[PDB]
Every structure is written in structure tokens, then in C-alpha cells.
Amino acid sequence: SSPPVVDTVHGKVLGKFVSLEGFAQPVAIFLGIPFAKPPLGPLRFTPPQPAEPWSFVKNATSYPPMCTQDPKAGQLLSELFTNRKENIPLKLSEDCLYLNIYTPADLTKKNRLPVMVWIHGGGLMVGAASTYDGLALAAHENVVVVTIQYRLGIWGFFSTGDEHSRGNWGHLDQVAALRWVQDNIASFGGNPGSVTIFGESAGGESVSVLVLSPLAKNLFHRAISESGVALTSVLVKKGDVKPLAEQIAITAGCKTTTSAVMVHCLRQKTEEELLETTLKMKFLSLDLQGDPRESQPLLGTVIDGMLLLKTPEELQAERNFHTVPYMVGINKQEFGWLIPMLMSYPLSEGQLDQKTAMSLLWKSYPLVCIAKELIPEATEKYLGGTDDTVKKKDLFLDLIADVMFGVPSVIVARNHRDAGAPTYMYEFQYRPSFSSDMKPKTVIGDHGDELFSVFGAPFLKEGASEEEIRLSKMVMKFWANFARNGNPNGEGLPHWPEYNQKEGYLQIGANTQAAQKLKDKEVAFWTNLFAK
Amino acid sequence: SSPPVVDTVHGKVLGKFVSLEGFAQPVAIFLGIPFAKPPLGPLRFTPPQPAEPWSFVKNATSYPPMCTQDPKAGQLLSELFTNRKENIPLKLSEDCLYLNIYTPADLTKKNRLPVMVWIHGGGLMVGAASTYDGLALAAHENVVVVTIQYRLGIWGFFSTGDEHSRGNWGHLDQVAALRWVQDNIASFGGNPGSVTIFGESAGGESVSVLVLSPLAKNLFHRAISESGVALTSVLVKKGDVKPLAEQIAITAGCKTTTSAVMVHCLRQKTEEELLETTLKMKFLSLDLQGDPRESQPLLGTVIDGMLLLKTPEELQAERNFHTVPYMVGINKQEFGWLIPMLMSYPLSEGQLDQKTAMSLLWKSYPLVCIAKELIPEATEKYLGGTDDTVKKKDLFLDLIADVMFGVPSVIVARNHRDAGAPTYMYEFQYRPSFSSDMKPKTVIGDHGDELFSVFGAPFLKEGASEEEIRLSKMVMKFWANFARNGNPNGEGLPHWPEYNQKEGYLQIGANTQAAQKLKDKEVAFWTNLFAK
Amino acid sequence: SSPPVVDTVHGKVLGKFVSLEGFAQPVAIFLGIPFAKPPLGPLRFTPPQPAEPWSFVKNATSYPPMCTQDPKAGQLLSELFTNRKENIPLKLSEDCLYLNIYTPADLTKKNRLPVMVWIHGGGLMVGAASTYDGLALAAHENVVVVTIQYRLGIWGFFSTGDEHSRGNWGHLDQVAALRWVQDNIASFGGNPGSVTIFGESAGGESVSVLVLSPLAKNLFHRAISESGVALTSVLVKKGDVKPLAEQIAITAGCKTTTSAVMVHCLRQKTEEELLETTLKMKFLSLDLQGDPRESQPLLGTVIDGMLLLKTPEELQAERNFHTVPYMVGINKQEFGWLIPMLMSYPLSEGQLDQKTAMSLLWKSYPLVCIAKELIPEATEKYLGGTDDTVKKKDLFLDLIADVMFGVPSVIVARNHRDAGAPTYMYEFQYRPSFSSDMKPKTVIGDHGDELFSVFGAPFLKEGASEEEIRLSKMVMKFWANFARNGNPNGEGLPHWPEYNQKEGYLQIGANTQAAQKLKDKEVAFWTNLFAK
Ligand SMILES: C[C@H](CCC(=O)O)[C@H]1CC[C@H]2[C@@H]3[C@H](O)C[C@@H]4C[C@H](O)CC[C@]4(C)[C@H]3C[C@H](O)[C@]12C
Ligand SMILES: C[C@H](CCC(=O)O)[C@H]1CC[C@H]2[C@@H]3[C@H](O)C[C@@H]4C[C@H](O)CC[C@]4(C)[C@H]3C[C@H](O)[C@]12C
Ligand SMILES: C[C@H](CCC(=O)O)[C@H]1CC[C@H]2[C@@H]3[C@H](O)C[C@@H]4C[C@H](O)CC[C@]4(C)[C@H]3C[C@H](O)[C@]12C
Ligand SMILES: CC(=O)N[C@H]1[C@H]([C@H](O)[C@H](O)CO)O[C@@](O)(C(=O)O)C[C@@H]1O
Ligand SMILES: CC(=O)N[C@H]1[C@H]([C@H](O)[C@H](O)CO)O[C@@](O)(C(=O)O)C[C@@H]1O
Ligand SMILES: CC(=O)N[C@H]1[C@H]([C@H](O)[C@H](O)CO)O[C@@](O)(C(=O)O)C[C@@H]1O
Ligand SMILES: CCCCCCCCCCCCCCCC(=O)O
Ligand SMILES: CCCCCCCCCCCCCCCC(=O)O
Ligand SMILES: CCCCCCCCCCCCCCCC(=O)O
Ligand SMILES: *[C@@H]1O[C@H](CO)[C@@H](O)[C@H](O)[C@H]1NC(C)=O
Ligand SMILES: *[C@@H]1O[C@H](CO)[C@@H](O)[C@H](O)[C@H]1NC(C)=O
Ligand SMILES: *[C@H]1O[C@H](CO)[C@@H](O)[C@H](O)[C@H]1NC(C)=O
């Protein structure tokens, strides 16, 4: 009929209607609504500022650029995670602080449906909101889906360790996007009083960080972390970041006389110059030689003193803060294929032996952070089993997957529980049909595999079996129900126990049913080993 | 006597005294009083900001730079319009937001004479305030003459179609200069309560735009448009300007990922780089090949939503706004020689035929905007007369002159009349002795010809006959009288009827006398044709 | 037992303890506390802005950079003035607005000791705060010593003569540092109510300027000028500075179309480009050829209308302002060796004759500003004595030393006296053992020779005789006592008469005793001659 025209605080917005077959009420889709002023020029390495009001009707009908990142790695990930039919080719630009909205509400009438803000993952180095289509989830569960974006890599996490460039710019963008929702979502038939944040991987770590951040207080009422939390060391930088700053500065051809000097110099660099720098620093790829403790992984969350007053560990060790329903989950094989492949892991052989194992585990320091003195014990605890070289490789992948997501996730869940807030956990175990062709038939429940069920990929792509079509319907029910009541349960779905003392959790997959004490053994072991 | 020292809001200003022979009270001349903060750096493509106060006495005794523009074309025009003896060689700089004042009032005593603010023309691409000397008009009619400047070309009209660079910067500069007058002219013996704005060519179109703009409300009490109004299509960009922005961006060696990106990039360019971009774009010159509908003539007035809430046409279709005495006039041969000679029209042959006529009229699209399907009818209506090839060229020149000034001007005048405000029209028909040597003696009342009478050129230059010396005295009387009572009439001058229902207008020239229905036939014809 | 951690308005600061042998309570030393936001980028040529607050504990344990300047000349001076054992190699950076604090107070308890802010010298073109160690003075006299820094050369004194770059940035930095002290020193056991400012050479001239500046009112309660005041023409630019600005602009490869243009262009230059410009200008070195009245010796204090409402001379001619105890002193031979040795003065011959004398005095115009018509009289009044060519050199050096410091200092002292405020004068006459090896042993009271006694160099360096060790103890007592009661006197010290009508002053040196009418003869003579 007629293009959707909503009125926001900064001005009228124009969208387009899209009908999901099987549903009458077409969903109103807005692409590219700016939630902050383009962090260009001097605004670089500074908190996001409010957007400028527009005089007439703004057309939110074109996919917004994605924050500057490594185009190759970026598009690759966008194609592997996208839940839509065709992958949308995105553009790169520092001007990327936008968000997309998918509202199934009949805008003609006053609607206040629950809101679900999605924070995409990509190790805080790559990623885009347009990758995740909300058409299905919005219609299928009748909730407003919001996909936001935030500065990545240098642009969003460069910190000099002091006031001259605290850092966490990216995290502040996410908060900024959340404030925008509180002041506008109501015009999109969404209830600003019922906003649920959820993300995968880095997005999960972000969701976890927002949960600990005082700034995010009152900006959301429910949180979900998918394969990633604030205890996922690889994403949270501790200690003196000054050295990393200086290394970047030099790589960017800048002086390092003082923090201010560095920041000023980098603000002079062109988007393009910093993009090259990014590639030079070779992030998201595991260094094989040199000292494993010097292979900086990827700029990340720091303890700026604004967003995070102290390390996550310290923070969660307190029950004096605002608590909300939190759902933390993981997948059967987090380090199954996706991450290992991307990082260009040396596993190219097919199998692995105790000796080469302790070697890789060492070079994998920037990911697991395991002292070289502990390497032996850890290796033995996991590969000490069968003498099967091929199995050691599989047990090795479990080793990493546990230190990065398994143990961290459960630890966070427990603390959220002991804090006195509704906690829920799950373990996605299913191999989507939308997986890559280069993904072994064996790998089931790899990193990001639940993203297809969560975003109803079966209802957008083709070939999904009735089994997958059903699984998706369930997951969305759970997620949506959680967004609503802060409880996944609802008639028509298996019972999902609350992660309390019994530590009950739901095993999601072809066979969905409750269970108890997730990674309980693992958490225990690693806690001791790491306690030196 | 001792140099004039006036006290303005921002600080003391120093000028110089200049006596016009025949007048006792010497006129106080101030050159280069800044009315806004230099729109340099990030201030580019943004509204003008207030000037910084100075600590002591500022010497307004040196002609201010002229806004960056084609130096050649610029000086050429400055020499052809200047009314002073010698042409003042101007400098180019982005730092050009200044104004010159010519006050005949005895500053030693409280004086509140009428103020006349002059907006120079030049297709918004070139021009300068220093070109027009106010010494004669100020003394001869005892009124304060103010010549202002405003950003030109890219610097003053680059619009991305959205909030990232709405545009009309130039028009905002004019408004800014008007506000300055309301807060300072009183210190120059001028009455802030009686400010009359007037300009020629784009200056007229500007005066016409200020009349429709809500921002200009209460900044002036009388307006005069000389050969140019808001209905002069070549100076108003309607539709999506986004494509033009992008074309400039590229030409400037910029990316066009997003509006913000474009604007940011251009703000990085040097004044010099944007000046070259300007030469490349080749404005002011009619493209002969390619598609006539793609030859963008020059950057201009847009509907930003701040200065203009909608197209002039829509605006004038309302009688719910602030109305003031408006005087709109034209010259016998608007497209006689000046304009064509500048744009390089292929008429050097001397004559023209029906066939080549329809051709030129087509390529002249960016000026007359005549559908190729209408070209035939229009051509026939004008050249269908004598078979004289030489006369067809003239009739052809009348064709264009009517669509650009004739019909537009009358249409505006009528609406201002029907609105209920004092309206006046005229048709200057005289060939000044100060014309160019390359201008054929047959062309009478060519574009800008009245500028010599209006600015008492005969009293500054040499060789003016007693007839011209007299004509000038009259025009100034009329103009000044209008500035005073909002009515040109006054004892000692022919009767100038008010442009009411009878549509009476004054025919100015060697033979000055009233007449009726100016371009009445033309307006009617073109209205029908264009309505097809 | 633990590094000192003070809490300032902007955040916690970390320092280090250092014990001066012979004193129990170790002094807390803070190096690099920022008192203003790095004047980088667009902040260049603008007043200093407040510093950004830091989230945790800032380590003030590393010597801050020194403001960009001629590194050679800079380090040379730092080595000749330093009172510490080893000369600290400093870094150059526009990011130099820092200050160092030396507090002998036991931070564990509430202490409010007198504060002494030191303004280093270096002709407003070189210098650093780290050069002067306060450990000794702080302990020995139990007062908080603060060494500040301020923009130098172009960075701190470039003025276009108007609001587009008034100038005196450097002086504003000093004021900024003083405001910081009023809002923080109390956290360092210092009494914000008893702040004494003191400096040598340009520092003295600054102290003298701050005394005349309305902005500095209430930021200090006592002032001391060592060899340098606001009447030291060489460091006070009068007249139109526009020409100097333009000359710099060009030398920097900038246009000079307008002030704004110049300032904008220079803000584009890199720290490095402006540093080369500095070197190209050659300020230190007295020009030998060309016109002496065109050899701009500086970039200095101007009459911006903000810091100074008018020339020092005019200002001191008033008794309607805030007055405080002022101590102005000079050294026996101000132009003895140091200054002349730096400007590469052509005195290498060893002697000088009446003829060559009048020659040098002329080329020394930018220092003494003596009309070529007066050169003869002046020369005769000083060298007209013995026919000894070698003595003429000596008397010649006295000539300059009197016009630059002698007469100016006394004139200032008298006016401060006649104003009605406690005035004190002295004449340091002693040759420190810490002098340069290339310094003749016949030169006593060279420029800056008192700096070793004032900063207890004998207690940091080695070889000081008991005579020098004693002299130092005395001077510090005097200085400290003054800072305390605004009176140098105190039991255990020779009587220091107040510079009243008797014009009594103290002769400091191996033989310390009062005297009267300092440079009385000189002041008189030069006053007449200069009055033409
Ligand atoms: C795609 C191909 C299977 C052949 C087929 O399906 O016809 C399989 C066989 C061996 C596989 C490789 C080996 O298993 C060794 C590596 C194992 C890692 O988990 C992924 C990368 C890794 C380098 C694998 C890439 C890909 O999955 C390969 C190359
Ligand atoms: C500039 C040139 C004079 C020759 C020269 O200077 O060497 C003159 C001679 C022929 C002139 C042209 C012809 O007279 C035909 C046209 C007459 C119109 O009145 C002006 C445009 C018009 C297109 C003229 C432009 C310009 O004045 C021309 C081109
Ligand atoms: C350093 C040297 C003494 C040699 C030594 O001590 O072994 C002395 C002897 C001659 C001196 C120079 C001569 O006395 C001439 C000049 C005298 C001025 O007062 C200082 C600069 C001046 C140019 C002196 C510089 C320096 O003090 C010199 C060069
Ligand atoms: C830059 C561009 O050409 N794309 C489009 C952009 C983007 O959609 C928005 O910036 C959100 O991404 O703006 C419009 O949509 C709009 O507001 O009218 C028009 C334009 O077609
Ligand atoms: C150097 C230069 O070009 N500027 C001239 C200005 C101009 O009047 C303003 O730029 C406005 O035109 O006037 C001065 O006398 C002045 O402001 O004191 C300085 C100089 O003569
Ligand atoms: C490279 C540099 O100069 N910065 C050093 C600063 C300076 O010492 C202070 O800014 C005073 O100069 O101290 C730090 O420890 C700090 O403040 O956190 C960081 C770093 O060591
Ligand atoms: C075809 C090879 C391209 C090179 C691949 C570049 C590596 C991209 C890495 C993808 C980001 C996902 C990492 C997740 C880390 C985490 O947050 O746990
Ligand atoms: C590059 C060589 C210089 C050629 C001269 C270019 C011609 C400039 C003419 C200025 C246009 C002024 C007339 C206004 C016409 C209009 O209203 O559009
Ligand atoms: C190219 C210029 C940079 C060279 C550095 C300038 C050196 C100046 C000499 C040191 C300052 C001591 C002289 C005091 C000046 C005075 O107040 O008269
Ligand atoms: C904006 O979208 C509307 C609705 O489709 C359309 O009419 C208009 O042309 C669009 N404007 C732009 C910028 O293309
Ligand atoms: C600051 O210095 C102190 C010791 O002087 C030390 O405890 C601390 O680690 C330093 N902080 C940093 C991060 O440099
Ligand atoms: C104003 O200052 C200018 C530039 O310094 C100078 O030429 C002039 O003497 C001053 N005023 C006048 C015109 O006397």
C-alpha cells in the first residue's frame, strides 16, 4: 500500500513493507536509521554524539555501510552467518553508526511489543548489522527486532590507557544505540520498557559487558549471551595497553612521544591509512613464530573507568548492582571449524599428537592464555585419553573451546545466579543445513550454528528440512518468550529449568531436553590449574 | 577631517572620509567589516557564525577579498558591472564574509537614514561586494548603502540533500549580514527599522528568496529585484540534488559512500583544490554536446527546509506570511549580449535559422528547461515571424530572455500583488555609455545595464552625457524614495503606477513613462505551453 | 614506605619520594602533572583549556617534554642553568603544558606551606621546567616548589595583531598553571593562599607581566623578578605586529591574504614544519648586516587586550590596581658572557674601540632599541673613559646590560614603590663555581649566576666551597622568607632594607650588605637620552 513513515525524535523516517509468506500483517523494515553523529574527523576515538535532526522525510531504505574492517574477512563472515537468501554486499565507511529495525506491529495503531536489540559478533574486528535479517523473527514471534552496529577495531577500541583515549568507543556506541531505542522504539510499535539485548560471539561478550557496565543500567531489561562473555579473556584487555597503542601508532607511521601525540596523529590518518594499518597488524589470525605472549589477538574491551570500573572478574564478584534475567549459552563444538579455519590454524594435517599439541596450545596463548608451565597438565587432561592421533586433535579442539567459551560462560552464569537474578543456560547441539561446504560432516554445533535457528534462517533460505524448520520455530519461541517475561518457558515448548543450585540447563538440538551441571567438571579443573 | 571611528557590537571600527564633489558632508566609507566568522576549516558547508570581538580599533580601510571563484570570470564581471572609475583588483579567499558601508550621515550626530543592502549577482558562482561603489548613491539620495558578500559556488551552495549538508550556505550568509545590520547599522547613522534589500541577477533571485524565507522575516522592510527572482529556474535546484553532490565529490577526488563521507572529504580539500574542481565542472559555460538535461549549469538555491520550506512556486501560492513593498523589474534585452557572451553561445555567426534555433534551445535546457517536445512550439511562436535569419537570432534571444526573466518576474509580481502587498514593476530600456566595446550598439537594455543608473555611475566615471547624468539622478531618486516610503513616487519624478490589477508599470529609459500589462502575452503563452 | 599518591581535582596522582641528605622528611616529587589540555591541532594559537580527568592513578614520575624549540640552543641552556648533578635530556613536543611539584610537607597530615611557582627563562624561545630541580629549596626552606612550563616561540607568541590570533598564548599558559595551583596545591601540602611567583630572565619579564595583567589578579600574593621585567623592550613587541606575522607565515610557506588565512595555514603545519621555520627565522643570533631595525629578535609579549590592556609603561603609570610584595633584582654583569656568547656577538677579538662600538650598538638595535642618532652620545657616556680598547669592551658590555636590565629593573621597582606596595631590590655579585669553563674568571654576576644560590645548587652538585654553600643557604632563606611574609628579612640574615624613598637595596654576594640608589645615575642618563 503506502511506505511506512514513522516520526522519531530527530525527524520522520521512511521505510518499506515486506510480507513473510504465511503472515498477513507485513513487517515494516527500516534500514540505516542513524543513531549517532558520524564519528568522522576529530570525533574519532571519542564517545558517540547525538545525530543531527533532519528537515523532511529521511529514507531508511538502503543498507548502511559497515564499519571499516578487513573487507575480505568481513564479507566472508557476513556470508557464513547471514540467514537471508542472498548475501548483501556491504560498503566500508567510518560512517557506520546506524541501526536497522524490523517491526511486525501495525504502525497504524498504538503497539508496544517487546524489543530485541541484536549485537553482531566478529571479534570486535569485523562485522555488520545488515548481515542478520530480522524479518522472520519479528513476524514469527511478534517482537520488534533491532540490529545495531558499532565501531570496530582501531576505530572502536584503540586505547592509550589514559584520558587521552580511554577506549571502548565501540561499547559506548552500543550503549548509544540503546539510548536511541529508549527514546524512539515506541514509535515503531516497540515497548521501550521491555528491551532485551542479545548477541553472538563478540556480541555476547558485549552483552556481558553491558550487563556489568553502570552506563548500560536501565537501557535494557533482559540479556542473552550466545557463545561469549566478559570472562572470554581474548576479548578483554587487562594490564597496560600503552604498549599496544604504541605498536599501532608506529605501524600507522606515528610518533609515540606521548599519548596525546599518538591520538592526534591517528586522527590525522585517513580511513584508508588506518585500514592498511589494520591489515599490517594482522589481527584475527594466529601467529605461529616468535613469542606467543606478544602476538596481540585483536584490540578489545579495556577497563576505561567509564564503561567498566574494573575487570569483569572483580565486578561479578559483587551482588550490589542492577540485575536482570540473563540467558548464557554455548554450542557443542565452539572451536569446531569456524574460528579455527578463519584464524588459519595449523591443523591442516587431520590429526595431532601430544607433542605438537602442547606446541599449538602455546602459540594459542593469545586465545587461551595458558602459562607454558601449565601447557603440559592441560594437554594431558584432555588428550591423555586415546592414543588416536585424530581423536587428540578433536579433544584438542575441545580444550580450546572450553577455555574460550565453556568454562567462562558457566562461571558467569553461576555468579549471575548467586547474585540473585534469573539465570538460564543452554547448549546448542545441531548442525545446520546452511553450513559451509568446507565444514566437515562430522562437526556438529560449531560456532554460530544457533544463529540460523535464532534468526529463522529456515524461513528465508531454502532446503531446510521439517526438522530444522521446527527447531527454528522452537528457539525463536524460547528467545521471544524470554524477551517477554524474562523466562524462556511457555506452553508448547520443552521445560527449560532455571540455572539455580541444581544447575539445570536445556540441551537444544534435534533432541531438546533438560540436563544438569554444564561443563561442571571442566570449570572445576581449569579453576585449579589456572590458580597455578 | 579625522578618520571616522564607529563603535559596533563587536568593537570599534575605523574608516575614511570621501567627498563627492558637489556635496559638502563627506561620506564615511568602511571597507571590510566582518559580519561573520571566517567559514574556514570545519566551518565550511555550515551556517555562518558570529564574529569574534576585537580588543582595539579595527581598520576597515582595505577592500576585503572576494569569495573563492573563477578568477578570470570573476574579474571580467567585476569590470563589466563596476560603476567606479578604476576597477579594483580583488583577492580570492574563503575568508570573504565581509560587508562595506557607505554612510552620508554626519556621524557626529544621531542619524537614522534609510538603509539599502545590496546583494551582488554572478549566478551565485562569481561576484564581489567591492565591485559596486556606493559613494554616489549614498550622497545623492542621503541613504546608507551597504554592499554585502556571501559564499559562492561549492563553498556556498553544496548540498547533499540531507542534514549532513543541507546547503544554501550563501543565502544564510546574506541573512547573517542582514542580522548584523539590525544590530549595528544604527551606529552608522542608519535606521535599522528601515532596511531595504536589493540586488541584480542572482542578487535579485536572492532578494526574492529572502522574501519567501521565514528566516529573513523582520530583517528588512522593502525589497527590490533587478532581473532575477525565485522563479528563475536556472538558480534553484529542485528534485534530488544527491547526484550533483556525488558528481562534485568525485570531481574533487572524493568518495561518495555516504553524504557524511562526502562532506567530510570536501572539508579536507584545500581552498585551492575546490577551486580547481570548480574550473573542471566548467559552470557558467553552456555545454554543446551530450544530453542537455545533464549539463548542470551551476550550484544554487535548494529547498533545505531551513531557509525555504518548499519550492518558491508553492510558497508564493500563499497569502499567510509577512509582506513588504516589493519592486521587481527587468531590462528590454535580458539575453542581449552579456549573458550569452559569457556562456559562449554559438551565435557568432550573426544570424540563426528555425532548425539551428530548436537545436540551441535544446542545449539551452539548463537555462530555460524546455522539454524537447515543446521546443518546436516555442521556437515557432517566436521565430515563426520574418524569414530574416538575422532577426530570428534576435527573436531567439528574446525567447530565452523571456523564460529566464520576463515571464518569471511578472508572475512573481502578480502573486506579491494578489498577496496584498505594495507591488511595483519596471522595464529598463537604455544603453549605458559605460557598456563594453564588444557589445553591439544595437543592444539596448542588456543584462545589468540599469546598474549604472542605480549606482550613479555617471557621477564616478567619465563621458556620461547630460541625458545619462539625468537618468541616473532619476533612478536613484526612485530607488531611494522606495527605500524610504516603500513607494518610488515623489515630486520631481514621472508617475510610477502601482502594479495592481491594471498591471501598470514604469518604462524607464531615455523616455520614462508608465504603461500596462508587462509581458502579459508572454506570461500567458509560456504558462500554457509549460503546462503540457 | 610507599609512593606518594595525592588526589587532585582531575584525579589521583602518583609521585616518588626523594630524601635530601641532612633532612629526615623526604620530599615528594611529582613530574609531569598536566595543567592544561595539550594545545595540539586546532587548539594551537588559542588559550589553554582545562585538562581531561583521568579514571585511575596517573603516574607523575617521568620528566615531561619541553615545548618545541631549537633543540641545540635549548639543551645548551638547560645544561648551563641546571642546578642538579646530571643534566636531564629532554624531549621536544607541542604537548608540553605540564608542571613539576616538590613538596617537603608530610602529605599524611594537613599542611599548608607557602608555594613558590617558578617560571623558567629562555627569551620566550627556549627553556623547560625540568631544568630547575626544587628538591633542595623545598627541603631547605620548607616550602612547596612548583616549576611550570608554557608555550614558546611561535607556538606561544604568534600574533596577527587581531582577534584571529591575539597572541601571548604563553603568558596565558602561565596564568593557567597559576589557576591550577589555586585549585590543587592544597593537596600537596601547599597553601593556595600564599603563592609566590618568581622567574629569571624571560621568566622575570613574565612575572612582571603577570603583575600588570588583570587576569593574574588573585592568583599569586608575592612576586620576584630576576634579571628581567616588562620594561625589557626586547621581550615586549609594540606597534604593528602584523608584519612579523606575515614574515613568519611566508617563511612557513603560508599565504598572507588575511589574518584568518595565516592562522589557519599555520594550524595546518606540522610541529616539525614550524620548528624548521623557527630555525629559518634565526632569533637567537644577532643579525650583523642589513638594517638593524628589521632584525626581529623575537616573538614576544604583545598588547593583546586580554592579558595586557596596554603597554607596561602605561600600566605602571597607575596606582589603581591590586598590589603585592615585589622583589626585583639584577646581577653585576648581566651582559657579561652568557647572553653575548649565545648570540655569537663579534667580541671574540678581546677588545673594542669607539668606532666599532657605535657599530655594534647599532646592530644591537633589536636589544637596546637605541636610535642611530643617539648611538654617539650613549657610546661616549660609557666608553669615553679610558683609552684602553679592552676596557671599552667591558664598558660596552655594561652599556647593553644597563639598557636591558639595569635601568628597566630600577624604573619598575620605583613605580611599584610609588604605587604603595612593598618593594625590594638586590644586586647579585658572585661568580658560581658551577659556571662554564668557557666563561672568563673575571666575570662576576653574569646572567643567571644567582640561579645556583636560589636553587641550592651547592646541595645537589659537587665542589661548592663552604662559602658558596653558605651563600646559597642565605639566598634561599631570603627568598623563602619573602614568599612567607612578603619580606626577605629574618633573624640570621643581613638586614635587607625596603626599596622606599632612600632606595636602599641589598648587595648579595661573598660580601652581603645594604646600599642605596641602584643604577641611579644610569636611570637618569638613559631617561634623558631616550627622551631624545
Ligand atoms: C573439504 C575436505 C573434505 C573432502 C570432501 O568433502 O569431498 C576436508 C578434508 C580434510 C579437511 C581439513 C582437515 O580436517 C585439517 C583441518 C581441520 C580443521 O578443523 C579445519 C581446517 C582443515 C584444513 C580441514 C579443511 C577441510 O575440512 C578439509 C580439506
Ligand atoms: C567578440 C566578437 C568580436 C571579435 C573579436 O573580438 O576579435 C563579437 C563579434 C560577433 C559577436 C556575436 C554576434 O554579434 C552575434 C550575437 C549578437 C548578440 O547581440 C550577442 C551574442 C552574439 C553571439 C555576439 C557575441 C560577441 O559580441 C561576438 C562573437
Ligand atoms: C674560553 C677562553 C679561555 C681559554 C682557557 O680558559 O683555557 C676565553 C679566552 C678569550 C675569551 C673571549 C674574549 O674575552 C672576548 C669576548 C669577551 C666577552 O666578555 C665574552 C665573549 C668573548 C668572545 C670571550 C669568550 C671566552 O671567554 C674566551 C674565548
Ligand atoms: C547515501 C545513499 O545514496 N543512500 C540513501 C541514504 C541512506 O538510505 C541513509 O543514509 C540510510 O542508510 O539516504 C536516503 O536513503 C535518504 O535518507 O533519503 C537516500 C539515499 O538513496
Ligand atoms: C592585512 C590585511 O589584509 N588586513 C587589513 C584589514 C582589513 O580591513 C580587513 O581584512 C577587512 O578588509 O585592515 C587592517 O588595517 C586592520 O584590520 O587593522 C589590517 C589590514 O590593513
Ligand atoms: C609516555 C608518557 O609520558 N606518559 C607517562 C605518564 C607521564 O609520566 C605523565 O603524563 C606525566 O608526564 O605517566 C603514566 O604512568 C600515567 O600517567 O599513567 C603513563 C606514562 O608512563
Ligand atoms: C579466507 C581466509 C580469510 C581470513 C580469515 C580472517 C579471520 C576472521 C575471523 C572471524 C572473527 C570471529 C572470531 C571470534 C572471536 C571471539 O570473539 O571469540
Ligand atoms: C573560464 C573562462 C571564463 C569564461 C567566463 C564564464 C562566464 C561567467 C558569467 C557569469 C554568469 C552571470 C550571469 C547570470 C545568469 C543566470 O542568472 O544564470
Ligand atoms: C632560531 C631561534 C632559536 C634559537 C634559540 C634562541 C636562544 C635565545 C637565548 C637564550 C635566552 C637568554 C637571553 C635572555 C633574553 C632577554 O631577556 O633579553
Ligand atoms: C524516498 O522514498 C520515497 C518512497 O518510495 C520515494 O518517493 C522517494 O523518491 C525517495 N527519495 C529518494 C531520496 O530517492
Ligand atoms: C606507576 O608507577 C608505580 C611505581 O612508581 C607502579 O606501581 C605502577 O605499576 C605504575 N603504573 C603504570 C601502569 O605505569
Ligand atoms: C590602523 O592600523 C593600520 C595598520 O597597522 C595602520 O596603517 C593605520 O595607521 C591605523 N589607522 C589609520 C588608518 O590611521
Side-chain angles (χ1 to χ4, degrees), chain C residues 124 168 171 174 197 202-214 216 220 225 228-231 235-236 301-302 307-308 312 315 321 326:
Chain C
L124 300 184
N168 291 336
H171 289 307
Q174 309 174 311
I197 53 173
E205 184 265 347
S206 297
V207 169
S208 178
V209 174
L210 289 180
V211 173
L212 309 170
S213 182
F220 62 103
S225 285
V229 293
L231 286 185
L235 293 195
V236 185
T301 314
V302 298
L307 180 90
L308 290 178
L315 296 171
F321 195 67
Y326 195 10

Side-chain angles (χ1 to χ4, degrees), chain C residues 480-493:
Chain C
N481 281 330
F482 186 66
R484 286 186 280 267
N485 324 301
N487 188 310
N489 290 296
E491 59 175 58
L493 308 163

Side-chain angles (χ1 to χ4, degrees), chain B residues 333 335-341 344-351 393-394 397 437-440 442-443 446:
Chain B
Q333 314 183 302
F335 208 60
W337 172 77
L338 187 62
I339 304 185
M341 163 280 281
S344 302
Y345 255 65
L347 296 169
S348 80
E349 271 295 299
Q351 64 284 289
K393 181 218 68 184
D394 288 327
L397 292 173
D437 298 280
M438 310 179 291
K439 176 199 204 188
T442 16
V443 178
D446 187 13

